[PDB]
Amino acid sequence: IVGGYTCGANTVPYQVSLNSGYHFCGGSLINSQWVVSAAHCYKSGIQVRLGEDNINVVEGNEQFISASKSIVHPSYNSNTLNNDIMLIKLKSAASLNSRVASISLPTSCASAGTQCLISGWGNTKSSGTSYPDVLKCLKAPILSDSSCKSAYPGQITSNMFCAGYLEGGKDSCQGDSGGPVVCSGKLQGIVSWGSGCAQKNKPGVYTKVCNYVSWIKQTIASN
Ligand SMILES: [Ca+2]
């Protein structure tokens, strides 16, 4: 997160870190046994780390649970990042409490102008590299489909939206991928892609979660 703020420990209780020896992506806990993340975060050997603030210090609220199964969206295209969503089933159910909690799935899509909270352990510099140990947050609005398409000609599908600031300075970044965009208490996006980070006229591009709720629910029901 570039241009954000320190969230506060365990204030984003659905935020997970995906660990393969190191933090490599965010995710969102959607029930006791399932995480939503970005398909481009897929790898084998994932440990889901819940209840994290400092990802380098054991602070007392962590739950570390191995993935038992990963499911990349059937239609994920890694070239275009269309359908950049994956589900991860935990080997055991998380224990849910005030600091480790699921986030609601949308029943309807969000609209341009809605403010949302974007969070993660990604890069904090736009012309630099600095990875935080504690969770960072950014409040940002959803941008119009037309401004999103104008920023990224030929690249925005019906499964993507833009959020952030066209002026630059405030965005998600490398290492935030797979993490949440939460709007009015609903998971509306997944950190997906963008040209650089926090660049002028190059907002963040997010997977449009509301398009996937039917797939999410049926997948959970059969797995
Ligand atoms: Ca920790």
Swiss-Prot record:
Sample GO molecular function, one term: serpin family protein binding
Cofactor: Ca(2+)
Disulfides per UniProt: 7-137, 25-41, 109-210, 116-183, 148-162, 173-197
Enzyme class: hydrolase
Active site: 40, 84, 177
GO BP annotation list: digestion; proteolysis
Chief location of this protein within or outside the cell: secreted
InterPro entries in the record: Peptidase_S1_PA (IPR009003), Peptidase_S1_PA_chymotrypsin (IPR043504), Peptidase_S1A (IPR001314), Serine_Proteases_S1 (IPR050127), Trypsin_dom (IPR001254), TRYPSIN_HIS (IPR018114), TRYPSIN_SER (IPR033116)
GO cellular component, one term: extracellular space
Cofactor note: Binds 1 Ca(2+) ion per subunit.
Tissue-level expression: Synthesized in the acinar cells of the pancreas.
Pfam family, one: Trypsin
Highest taxon of the lineage: Eukaryota
Positions annotated to bind substrate: 171-172, 174-175, 177
Subcellular location field: Secreted, Extracellular space
Annotated positions binding Ca(2+): 52, 54, 57, 62
Assembly: Interacts with SERPINA1.
Protein's recorded name: Serine protease 1
Gene name, Swiss-Prot/TrEMBL: PRSS1
